[PDB]
Write a protein that binds this DNA or RNA. Structure first.
Lengths: 290, 366, 347, 219, 145, 366
DNA sequence: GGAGTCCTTCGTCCTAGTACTACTCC
DNA sequence: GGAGTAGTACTAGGACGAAGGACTC
């Protein structure tokens, strides 16, 4: 919630005038609360190598570490793992696992309640029974080294002064052996790897737009320098043509925007907060529109 | 249908004609033999659509005509494995061929003759006969220089070029060429035709280089060869052959002869310390002497010095040694003559004592 | 999805081109947009760069062989090259894509010889002296479905076929073994050995956008049924289907097979053609007649729809010739689409 | 001498006695001697004494009116007994078939004891289950496994499965045997914690106890 | 270690205090920094010279340096191995003794107990536990697989 | 380091020493030779790291001690390639080995002798010599029954067992077994050792059967074999050879005697039509007759009737035909006597004239 | 709660080794 | 005709890339 800081804006940490839009710093740093308020600023993964470089120049490559995340053994994975060890080809097992809904927290007990075909194939198939009975014994167990970073840590000395590392076969891509919650409770501040392809897109599209410079001598385009009330923008939005428009790609969300016809910037700030199960099923969306 | 024949008459034909037939072809009746009894004759067929080999054998004991096609490999192994002198009695009954011989009794699965691809009749255009021994020479001296699996599909084979009363062969892969020609003593038309690699392998195979006359009839796109009661027929491929008159070296000024086995044993030895993949060696030649040097990454060296007949200037040139080793092995002669021009140009190579044969392999840039 | 969005917006959208494409979708002056190379599905990032790199150092690619020589197989694999043709990147040079598919292997083999020729420095003897995303989608359906004008099987279109792939098959008729016909949009045939027989092995591709399937534990006839099975770029076959407990598909035995060509016989299945109003006359007695004349077989009635301004009348050719079924492919060759109707005779 | 049987029935009772209320409709058995099919098959059809089960009907097509003129188990009791007596009985799920067999035998009221008292009762499914543990060992499973045609076989019903089970049985009891082969107190040091270590211990336990409210060392 | 050549042995190292903790942290980092194969990163025996303070070590048992050398019956190699711990870890080296019913464990144990009395060095037994109950063993076997 | 030897003293040693070289010497110096020059003796080593092969050539010309390690295959081919009586000069020039012959010159890379791996010294425990002849028969008679790749790795080798005047060798698959016993002419204490199959192949190849006696020593963990001046030493895979006395049939009461060649010919022919996987042939014995038959699912069938000396009851029995053909090929003899129990027991087979070798194959249930 | 970063696993293609069978030499 | 050498065929292992289930805030 760092956009509530005008200092972040002043420093070019953030991109928004918080006093223009009533954005609040005390969500992000509250002085009347005593626990570290992890500021967690994130950036584009594409350019990790360039940032590792800067932060090594800054502190020392050995004083810098990536933070590991961990793979457990959840519903679809445990079915897959046991199935292969029991000597089925992938086809057999996938015809079972595709019946399990995608759901984040899935367990075998939850799977049995959501899907009636699970009980059925369990009782009708020896192999499936043996498999799930064993998947039940191992549900949620670890399997491997966490995949890369979730965030990057900054120590004042060697990171190994505080945590163990994992590194690859070339001793590269070092990661802290404690995970995100654990590593920070052991005292070191972390910096997460923002997940977007949108800035990569902007970047490349700007290169291509700004080449239309010499084609007719046009100044380079500064996305920060655009007017914030643009009618073309609001015209196209009122026309509901917002697939491929960042954040607003959902069919449902397009349905909502069509009925709502959002016509000012404030409304555009509101859209993600409006587009939720609570607001819609408490009449607030209808009230707002009306 | 019913026949009786002597293992001994049947066995070498069986071997020669089964030879090239794939254990498992892509069209599996191609692993069966077509058997036909008509007149006093058993006709045997193995083909691959490109070539066809036919054997005929006269039926001495009571018989009845008909057609069928039997699994080639297993049947040949059965026939080969039979006891000495075995006279086997065979008869078609329904969809099985039953083989009796003494107290051995068989009933083999059978595929219909009707399903078998009957190869194409064509019109003969030019024909000739010659000693088996000339043919065998022609082929042996030359066949190892053909390509294997060249994309210029017309090099997978050998062009026969006929002019006046002479027949000539050349075989090549575009990196080495060998020419061998023999007088045939018959006025022919003028025709060139390239017959396939596998056809020539098998024709050489069956050349019982004895007395037997060999008579050949050529078409525009097919070839026919009769030796005795073996008949070979192949389709041809069309392709515009390269001109051997541009390949024959322009003016070889320097001439060099040497005794073949000594030359060959020396090349075989220098070859050991050449790059294993490219077989590259360097030749240094000087007044009455030859020095070949090579190298490998292991930092080993080979050097051979030998006395050679050479009049001419010193010269430096590199080759792929496989290419020269292969000619030295095939050339079963006493002395050789090499006709080179220079380091950058084609060379003619020949038996110092015969003139039937001539070879050009190109030098290398390393 | 994105393209359909572009199109609705007022966005188009050139097909790929080896010569013009960059990594990303690019703006030539007029062409707002042309395919980026990375856009192609199967092609790796390394191969895309390789292509472009070769094109940079050399000129724009002249021919198939020119391409092969500049860029080795290491960079652009066979599988890579297959998708490139199917995308239509090569269309410029090799007007016929069918021709280009066939020419790949030889050029590939050729190129390996070219690599070898380079490395050895070695001297040689002399030598060797319209639309964007609508063609590509069309190709996919040839390989993964095509079923234009219904299917040669008009008397029994999908009525027999079913073409939903695994997803339809699961809920099937219960029986000893389901009755099913599969056709394959792709086939490669290999038979193994061990020096004393061996049952196997068939390779089909199975639709809808499913995957591919084996057959499967048989072939019956022995080797005559094995050859019917063959046919690459072509196959229809009829088999028994059950839900196999063992996975990698369901089980197929071939009880009967008929070819596409046989289905195209459209027994009692046959031919009608739709042509535009303006036809010469000579077309009636010349090109139209000649297409039919050399390919005759399987008494198929010829039906003719002459679209008149006034009305639709049916003139039955029945001059003599009954067309062979291979004619669809030949006819589709130029400018004329036909439709495969229920044959008049059967009803 | 090896005797193969496959019995098609008027369905089963799913609860209690699987034979109660049911009788035999068809007997299809093949004789197998030295792993070769002699062709001296026992194939009879019987009196239903009841309705053919809807399930059984869908399996291979059998109507009650077809098995009416056909003889009962009593007419071929001795005939079938002598055909299998003093031989190997290979069955699928022996508890099921043997249960039906002995059931019919007791219905004859000739005091007939269980078949297992005068014959070697062997289930082939149990053998397959021992060979392929936890795998589907059904007839069609094994059929596909050992490369067999079950589609172009004219025999519909018992004799079909019997023949197939014979080929499966041969496959399992191939190929080849295995070679019978397989086959004081003293001192030693106790290291007593030093005073430094004891102090660290005390302090470490203090932390556990002060923060957690317990100490088992000390509980 | 240089004593067994290529052969990797299994080892327990405990850090007894915060000096040990930091040494253990640096030891682990050094294994990863060296690089490795499918087996994972490995330590050299001699890294325990520098990375030493505050650590308490277990011999490895049958699967260790000394156990494997004992089973070979190379008395010189065994003596070289223990000697290292006598030099760099006085009062801080314990010989592991194990009864889990596995091949050669009793023969090793008998010979290790004789060595342990002959050297006057201290021993500890553990059960090298990987699971809660004996019936969990089969499932863990499959987990590893 | 310098020595000079004549090609013909080097050639048979070199060939023999180069046999163990093959399997993917990852450690590159395994593809090379160990040379120690001392006395008038150059010693050779050829090794796969588990076994070692030693050769001496006498040095008649000038010599000087020293050691290095030259590439073995390349060096062997060069020597084999040179003409008979060609003069080879060795001389170490710093970090190259120079090999000269008169006017030809070759240079080898040098890796130090000191890097060549050394196997531990061990001592002999039981000692014997025997005629080459006896060793020849022993190996030849049984080699075919070696396991190919077995999880029971101890079966990948041959048990040599001594006691009194009897050595008996055995090699097996877990399916079939071949046994041979020969007189050695000296009372020998009991020992049991299994030499790995590649080892026995190499040992087989060094036997010309000739006049030099062979002297073998066996230690605790190794074996050493001297014939004249060449010495092969291998490790043993240690023990638990299962008791072959247990598998032997316990007095087979029925005897079946027949001409080895006839019988073998018929089985080779019948084998062609049996099962891929199981090699299945079905056999009927009856009053003075033997009927061989072969089946496959496509109804292809080989069938033989034969006149067989046999007293006993009718019975049928099947087996893996490849394994029984292997024994008939190793049985280089006039008459075989086959001694049975029943259709479901292993059968023991011998030469009808010697009990010295015994062959027992299990039955298949086909 | 959504989206992206994460690797691993599955499938396909290429390379290397090993055995068998044919061809050439004794 | 048989034995040795070479070539062909089959099988295993490793690499590369596209697909999928998962754990990050």
């Amino acid at each position: 919630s760092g956009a509530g800081s005008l200092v972040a804006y002043a420093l070019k940490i953030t991109d928004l005038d918080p006093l223009e839009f009533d954005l609040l710093f005390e969500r992000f740093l509250n002085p009347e609360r005593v626990s570290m308020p992890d500021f967690d600023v994130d950036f584009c993964m594409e350019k990790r190598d360039q940032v590792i470089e800067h932060v090594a120049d800054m502190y020392g490559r050995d004083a810098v570490s990536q933070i590991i995340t961990f793979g457990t053994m959840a519903a679809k994975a445990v079915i897959r793992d046991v199935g292969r060890v029991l000597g089925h080809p992938y086809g057999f097992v996938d015809r079972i696992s595709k019946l399990i809904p995608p759901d984040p927290g899935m367990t075998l007990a939850k799977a049995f309640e959501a899907e009636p075909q699970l009980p059925e194939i369990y009782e009708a198939d020896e192999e499936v029974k043996a498999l799930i009975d064993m998947a039940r014994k191992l549900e949620g167990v670890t399997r491997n080294a966490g995949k890369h970073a979730g965030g990057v840590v900054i120590a004042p000395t060697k990171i190994t002064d505080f945590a163990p590392l994992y590194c690859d076969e070339e001793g590269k891509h070092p990661v802290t052996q404690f995970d995100k919650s654990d590593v920070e409770y052991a005292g070191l501040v972390k910096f997460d790897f923002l997940g977007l392809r949108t800035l990569t897109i902007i970047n490349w599209a700007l290169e291509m737009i700004n080449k239309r410079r010499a084609k007719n001598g046009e100044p380079p385009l500064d996305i920060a320098a655009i007017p914030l009330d643009d009618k073309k923008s609001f015209d196209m939005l009122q026309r509901s043509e917002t697939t491929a428009v960042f954040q607003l790609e959902s069919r449902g969300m397009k349905d909502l925007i069509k009925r709502l016809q959002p016509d000012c910037f404030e409304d555009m700030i509101a859209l993600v907060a409006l587009f939720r199960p609570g607001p819609l099923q408490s009449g607030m969306v209808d009230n707002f529109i009306d | 249908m019913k026949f009786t024949v002597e293992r001994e008459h049947l066995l070498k034909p069986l071997q020669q004609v089964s030879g090239p037939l794939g254990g498992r072809p892509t069209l599996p009746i191609l692993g069966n033999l077509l058997l036909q009894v008509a007149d006093g004759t058993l006709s045997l067929t193995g083909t691959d659509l490109e070539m066809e080999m036919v054997a005929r054998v006269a039926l001495v004991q009571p018989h009845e005509p008909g057609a069928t096609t039997v699994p080639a490999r297993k049947f040949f192994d059965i026939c080969r494995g039979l006891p000495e002198g075995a006279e086997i009695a065979v008869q078609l009954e329904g969809e099985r061929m039953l083989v009796r011989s003494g107290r051995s009794r068989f009933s083999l699965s059978t595929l219909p003759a009707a399903d078998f691809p009957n190869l194409d009749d064509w019109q003969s255009e030019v024909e000739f006969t010659l000693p088996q021994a000339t043919m065998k020479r022609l082929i042996e001296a030359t066949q190892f220089s053909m390509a294997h699996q060249d994309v210029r599909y017309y090099l997978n084979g050998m062009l026969f070029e006929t002019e006046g009363e002479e027949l000539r062969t050349v075989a090549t892969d575009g990196h080495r060429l060998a020419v061998c020609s023999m007088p045939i003593g018959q006025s022919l038309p003028s025709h060139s035709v390239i017959v396939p690699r596998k056809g020539v392998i098998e024709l050489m195979r069956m050349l019982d280089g004895g007395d037997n006359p060999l008579r050949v009839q050529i078409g525009s796109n097919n070839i026919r060869a009769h030796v005795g009661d073996f008949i070979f027929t192949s389709k041809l491929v069309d392709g515009r052959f390269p001109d051997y008159r541009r390949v024959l070296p322009k003016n070889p000024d320097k001439h060099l002869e040497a005794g073949c086995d000594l030359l060959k044993q020396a090349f075989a030895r220098a070859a050991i310390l050449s790059n294993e993949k490219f077989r590259g060696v360097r030749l240094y030649v000087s007044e009455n002497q030859l020095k070949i040097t090579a190298n490998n990454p292991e930092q080993e060296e080979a050097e051979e010095i030998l006395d050679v007949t050479y009049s001419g200037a010193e010269m430096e040139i590199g080759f792929n040694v496989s290419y020269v080793l292969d000619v030295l092995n095939a050339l079963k002669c006493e002395n050789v003559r090499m006709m080179l021009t220079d380091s950058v140009s084609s060379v003619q190579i020949e038996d110092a004592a015969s003139q039937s044969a001539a070879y050009v392999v190109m030098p290398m840039r390393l | 999805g994105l393209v359909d969005e572009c199109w609705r917006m007022g966005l188009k959208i050139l097909p790929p081109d080896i010569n013009s494409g960059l990594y990303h979708f690019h703006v030539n002056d007029d062409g707002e947009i042309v395919y980026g190379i990375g856009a192609i599905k199967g092609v790796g990032e390394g191969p895309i760069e390789a292509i472009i790199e070769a094109r940079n150092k050399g000129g724009y690619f002249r021919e198939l062989f020119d391409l092969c020589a500049r860029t080795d197989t290491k960079k652009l694999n066979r599988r890579v090259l297959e998708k490139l043709i199917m995308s239509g990147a090569f269309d410029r040079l090799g007007p016929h894509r069918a021709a280009l598919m066939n020419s790949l292997g030889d050029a590939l083999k050729a190129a390996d010889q070219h690599a070898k020729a380079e490395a050895i420095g070695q001297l040689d003897l002399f030598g060797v002296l319209p639309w964007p995303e609508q063609v590509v989608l069309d190709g996919e359906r040839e390989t993964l479905g095509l079923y234009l004008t219904g299917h040669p099987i008009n008397q029994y279109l999908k009525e027999i076929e079913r073409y939903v792939g695994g997803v339809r098959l699961k809920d099937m008729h219960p029986t000893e073994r389901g009755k099913v016909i599969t056709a394959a949009g792709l086939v490669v045939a290999a038979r193994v050995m061990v020096t004393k027989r061996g049952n196997r092995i068939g390779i089909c591709t199975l639709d809808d956008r499913s995957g591919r399937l084996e057959v499967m534990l048989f072939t019956d006839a022995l080797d005559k049924y094995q050859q019917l099975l063959e046919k690459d770029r072509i196959l229809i076959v009829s088999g028994q289907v059950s839900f196999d407990d063992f996975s990698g598909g369901l089980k197929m035995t071939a009880r009967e097979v008929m070819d596409i060509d046989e289905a195209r016989e459209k027994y009692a299945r046959g031919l009608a053609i739709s042509l535009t109003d303006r036809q010469i006359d000579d077309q009636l007695l010349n090109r139209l007649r000649q297409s039919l004349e050399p390919h005759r077989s399987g008494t198929i009635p010829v039906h003719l729809y002459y679209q008149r301004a006034d009305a639709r009348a049916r003139l039955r050719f029945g001059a003599t010739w009954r067309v062979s079924p291979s004619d669809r492919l030949l006819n589709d060759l130029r400018g004329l689409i036909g439709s495969e109707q229920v044959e008049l005779e059967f009803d | 001498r090896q005797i193969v049987l496959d019995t098609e029935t008027t369905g089963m009772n799913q609860i209690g006695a699987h034979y109660e209320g049911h009788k035999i409709i068809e007997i299809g058995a093949v004789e197998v001697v030295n792993r070769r099919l002699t062709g001296n098959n026992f194939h009879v059809y019987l009196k239903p004494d009841r309705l053919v089960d809807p399930e059984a009907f869908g399996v291979h097509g059998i109507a009650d009116e077809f098995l009416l003129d056909k003889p009962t188990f009593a007419e071929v009791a001795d005939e079938f007994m002598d055909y299998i007596r003093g031989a190997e009985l290979v069955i699928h799920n022996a508890a099921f078939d043997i249960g039906f067999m002995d059931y019919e035998f007791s219905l004859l009221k000739r005091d007939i004891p269980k078949t297992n008292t005068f014959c070697k009762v062997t289930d082939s499914l149990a053998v397959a289950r021992k060979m392929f543990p936890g795998k589907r060992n059904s007839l069609d499973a094994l059929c596909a496994r050992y490369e067999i045609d079950n589609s172009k076989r004219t025999l519909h019903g018992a004799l079909l499965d019997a023949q197939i089970l014979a080929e499966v049985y041969l496959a399992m009891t191939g190929g080849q045997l295995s070679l019978p082969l397989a086959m004081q107190a003293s001192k030693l040091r106790v290291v007593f914690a030093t005073d430094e270590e004891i102090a660290a211990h005390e302090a470490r336990l203090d932390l556990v106890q002060k923060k957690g409210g317990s100490c088992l060392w000390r509980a | 270690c240089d004593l067994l050549g290529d052969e990797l042995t299994h080892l327990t190292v405990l850090a007894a205090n915060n000096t040990g903790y930091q040494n253990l942290t640096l030891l682990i980092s050094k294994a990863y920094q060296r690089g490795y194969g499918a087996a994972g990163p490995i330590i050299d025996r001699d890294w325990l010279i520098e990375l030493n303070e505050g650590l308490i070590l277990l011999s490895g048992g049958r699967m260790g340096d000394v156990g494997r050398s004992l089973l070979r019956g190379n008395s010189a190699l065994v003596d070289e191995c223990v000697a290292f711990y006598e030099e760099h870890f006085p009062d801080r080296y314990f010989l592991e003794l194990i009864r889990t019913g596995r091949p050669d464990e009793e023969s090793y144990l008998h010979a290790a107990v004789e060595l342990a009395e002959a050297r006057g060095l201290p021993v500890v037994a553990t059960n090298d536990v990987r699971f809660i109950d004996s019936s969990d063993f089969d499932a863990h076997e499959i987990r590893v697989a």
